Design a protein around this ligand. Structure first.
Ligand SMILES: Nc1nc2c(c(=O)[nH]1)N[C@H]1[C@@H](S)[C@@H](S)[C@@H](COP(=O)(O)OP(=O)(O)OC[C@H]3O[C@@H](n4cnc5c(=O)[nH]c(N)nc54)[C@H](O)[C@@H]3O)O[C@H]1N2
Ligand SMILES: Nc1nc2c(c(=O)[nH]1)N[C@H]1[C@@H](S)[C@@H](S)[C@@H](COP(=O)(O)OP(=O)(O)OC[C@H]3O[C@@H](n4cnc5c(=O)[nH]c(N)nc54)[C@H](O)[C@@H]3O)O[C@H]1N2
Length: 794
């Protein structure tokens, strides 16, 4: 059937779609988008796939025995189907039992993640609002991306920096001589955004490729691996041993002292503490000068190459662009801190195309905003007019808010006391947990340790669109529909604010699935508080209310038509903006425009932190050895290979791994691909296409061989997001519940360690990992990850 195209959008971009034979016929890019992503070929598979959640289900023994069931069985995949009313009655009864027997400290419902775009249907917000109307629970602070970075920068530059707007791309293209990409791959990571992604940044990357060819701009990539960006631009690379970056920075600062290359004016007028740091680099107290000769065998860079780099950074106007990966390792606050110190010693902060950036690889930061106000959202909290059924604040002496990544450690040892960014934290006694809009069995580390911690839980509830590993390890499960099976509203470009889009319903929700609004409105009915929850409005009434409010705010500078007209058009345009320079104000007059630090200047040495007395984070940057390190680091005698689980090029974390046809374009021999170097492959007799087994003293998995020159000796890669699918010793689905079971597909976190960054931020350290690998020789199993549950009938 040939009809008019409809409008919509997602984290991958804005689209245009047409329907035929009652199904979505085809996807086309939105007109204004000139650089779409290849992942546009996987969209249709996300809605029509084999891992779809058909109806509500409850785990066998839990259905039969309630909170007194055999928890050792989680993971075997056997479930029983039930009606919506029965499933909701059970859910509520469980919340009753826990508030009564234990109280608020025994429930954890605050985990967040990459939920789909949409101002009205946002899943995590609907769950928390309804559950709150029942009773309180435990919350968290932080995230898995910039955990350490966001905790340290406020002390140095006076802000988190990572999520702020930066210097405009044009100003950079016209003034920068050298652009340093340190642990940064923007060509690959710019394909997605927080809101509908405009992809504007790709036009500027194209202009950059020109400058590189003409020989007008020099780009240097400091990375242990050859990146996608380096290949696209045709620029150079500087190898560095993984995790040894800090020794290089210290050596560079040593050259600048000896041969007077640092800007003395900027230091004296814009910072504090330089004179307290010098002694360390110079070795006047500890006994060792941090010279290039010293750093060389550690970082893997020759003394003369280090001196050459130093002269280059002061030769012209230099612009630093740091990624996020480097701070996701043990002591991750150090490289971020020491970087800011180098930028200060150079003294080009505040100039167009000079200084340092921590985010030009995220949601098109660098393209100027229109200046318009964006639309509001559905509330995730109770309204001033209401109260919950219970409402107790007794946490039995424990903390009501914990560091995001310490949640497993708390289930394992309640009542323990930990240090945390200048305060004390006490772990609560958790018995029940709720998940919506996130996938814990993908994002956390150490699968086999997580299995032991789960044995101590009484109830686990999950709402998702597909049968993910998290659902596989739950007690009650509820089905939701995709954004293409409902109506919503969203802004175009998280930082651009180019306009406002319309997310129109394409087809009817499949099977027994429901929209997140519907799911929690029914729950509110059980509690007898339906109207209060919804504010007495439906889907379209809510959307119309949010548009009108946005139009009200923008009344002064932007014109907008009425809702009826807007919906028919499917889009409303805002405009372009003017260029801007990041730290120009503080530069012009630091007396008038100080920073948010305690003194108002840049702090190379902080009195505040030094006062804490922490052993693994002191008054100034230092080099400290890690627990597991390659190329001569501790532990490389038994497990020589470094494992990096860098973000995927053809997925958004775990989202899209379910798209059948599209996935089969990169899968190898049924498994997820492992990228291996020629030298290491030869030493083990491995060839392309062979099934490989990667392991260590904590876990084991299977994967497909891919030999590549982009990987140096001693390093392998397996992308984060590959679905966890364990099997027994006989290759069965059910045996997958066993502690120590082999993963038939290849999830990297099956081999990772659960450690805290340092006493300062207590964040994720996933990249500190050592392993070993061999050619798999045993009976080959079938993948259990994508085929859904075993249905048991009573
Ligand atoms: N080893 C290693 N570990 C890492 C990382 C690493 O570099 N290495 N990187 C990490 C970071 S940066 C982050 S962002 C993280 C990602 O996991 P996550 O947030 O759960 O998103 P996700 O994985 O995409 O899963 C989101 C789930 O949400 C569901 N969903 C999405 N939208 C909807 C919706 O509208 N309603 C409902 N009911 N659910 C919805 C998805 O189906 C998915 O299962 O994993 C970190 N961990
Ligand atoms: N296509 C796609 N886009 C996305 C995402 C996605 O899932 N898919 N997710 C997004 C979110 S969640 C966030 S957190 C972000 C990821 O940033 P980042 O960790 O820096 O990318 P990274 O790729 O994990 O790492 C970048 C580089 O860091 C190098 N590296 C890693 N460790 C070190 C080290 O110690 N020393 C040095 N010098 N460099 C190191 C890596 O080689 C990689 O090139 O990317 C978003 N964009």
């Amino acid at each position: 059937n040939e009809d008019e195209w409809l409008t919509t959008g997602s984290h991958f971009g804005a689209f245009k779609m047409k329907r035929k034979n009652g199904v979505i016929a085809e996807v086309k890019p939105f007109d204004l988008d000139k650089y779409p992503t290849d992942m546009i070929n996987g969209i249709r598979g996300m809605v029509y796939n084999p891992s779809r959640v058909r109806y509500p289900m409850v785990r066998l023994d839990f259905l039969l025995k309630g909170h007194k069931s055999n928890t050792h069985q989680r993971g075997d995949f056997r479930f029983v189907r039930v009606t919506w009313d029965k499933a909701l009655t059970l859910f509520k009864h469980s919340l009753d039992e826990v508030q009564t027997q234990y109280g608020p400290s025994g429930l954890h419902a605050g985990q967040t993640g990459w939920r789909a775009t949409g101002q009205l249907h946002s899943s995590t917000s609907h769950m928390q609002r309804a559950v709150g109307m029942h009773g309180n629970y435990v919350k968290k602070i932080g995230d898995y991306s910039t955990g350490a970075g966001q905790t340290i920068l406020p002390y140095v530059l006076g802000s988190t920096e990572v999520y702020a707007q930066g210097t405009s791309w044009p100003l950079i293209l016209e003034h920068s001589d050298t652009i340093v990409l340190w642990s940064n791959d923007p060509y690959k990571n710019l394909q997605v955004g927080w809101n509908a992604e405009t992809h504007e940044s790709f036009a500027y990357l194209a202009q950059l490729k020109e400058k590189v060819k003409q020989g007008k701009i020099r780009v240097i990539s400091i990375d242990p691996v050859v990146t996608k960006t380096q290949a696209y631009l045709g620029c150079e690379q500087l190898y560095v041993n993984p995790q040894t970056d800090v020794t290089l920075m210290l050596a560079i600062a040593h050259e600048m002292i000896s041969k007077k290359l640092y800007d003395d004016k900027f230091i004296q007028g814009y910072s504090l503490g330089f004179e307290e740091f010098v002694p360390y680099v110079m070795g006047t107290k500890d006994g060792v000068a941090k010279t290039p000769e010293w750093a060389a065998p550690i970082c893997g860079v020759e003394a003369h190459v280090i001196r050459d780099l130093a002269k280059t950074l002061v030769k012209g106007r230099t612009q630093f662009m740091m990624g996020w990966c480097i701070q996701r390792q043990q002591h991750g606050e150090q490289p971020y801190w020491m970087a800011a110190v180098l930028a200060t010693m150079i003294g080009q902060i505040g100039l167009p195309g000079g200084g340092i950036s921590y985010g030009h690889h995220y949601s098109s930061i660098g393209v100027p905003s229109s200046g318009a106000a964006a639309p509001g959202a559905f509330p995730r909290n109770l309204d001033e007019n209401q109260k919950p059924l219970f409402d107790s604040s007794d946490f039995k002496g424990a903390s009501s808010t914990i560091p995001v990544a310490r949640w497993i450690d708390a289930i394992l040892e309640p009542g323990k006391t930990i240090d945390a960014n200048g305060s004390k934290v006490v772990y609560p006694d958790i018995k029940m947990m709720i998940f919506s809009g996130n996938n814990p069995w993908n994002h956390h580390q150490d699968r086999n340790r997580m299995k032991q911690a789960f044995h101590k839980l009484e109830c686990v509830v999950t709402v998702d669109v597909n049968w993910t590993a998290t659902c596989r390890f739950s007690d009650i499960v509820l089905p939701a529909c995709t954004t293409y099976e409902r109506n919503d509203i969203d802004v175009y470009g998280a930082y651009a604010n180019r306009g406002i889009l319309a997310m129109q319903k394409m087809v009817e929700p499949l099977f027994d699935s429901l929209s997140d609004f519907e799911i929690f409105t029914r729950f509110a009915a059980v509690l007898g508080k339906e109207k209060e929850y919804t504010r007495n409005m439906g889907e379209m009434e809510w959307l119309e209310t949010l548009y009108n409010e946005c139009k009200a705010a923008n009344a002064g500078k932007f014109e907008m038509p009425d809702f009826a007209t807007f919906w028919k058009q499917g889009y409303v345009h805002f405009g372009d903006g003017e260029v801007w320079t990041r730290h120009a104000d503080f530069r012009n007059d630091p007396e008038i425009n100080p920073l948010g630090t305690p003194s108002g200047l840049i702090e190379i040495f902080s009195r505040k932190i030094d006062q804490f007395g922490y052993d693994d984070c002191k008054g100034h940057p230092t080099w400290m050895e890690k627990t597991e390190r390659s190329h001569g680091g501790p532990g490389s005698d038994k497990h020589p290979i470094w494992l990096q689980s860098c973000h995927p090029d053809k997925r958004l974390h775990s989202q899209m791994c379910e798209s059948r046809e599209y996935r089969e374009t990169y899968a190898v021999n049924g498994r997820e691909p492992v990228y291996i170097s020629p030298v290491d492959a030869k030493a083990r007799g491995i060839k392309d296409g062979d099934i490989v087994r990667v392991f260590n003293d904590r876990g084991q998995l299977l994967a497909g061989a891919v030999v590549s020159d982009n990987f140096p000796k001693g390093i392998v890669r397996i992308h984060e997001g590959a679905w966890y699918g364990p099997v027994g010793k006989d290759g069965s689905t059910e045996g997958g519940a066993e502690v120590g079971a082999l993963c038939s597909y290849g999830d990297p976190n099956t081999l990772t360690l659960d450690i805290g960054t340092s006493k300062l931020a207590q964040a994720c350290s996933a990249y500190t990992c050592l392993v070993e690998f061999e050619k798999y020789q045993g009976k080959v199993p079938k993948v259990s990850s994508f085929d859904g549950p075993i249905e048991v009938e009573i």
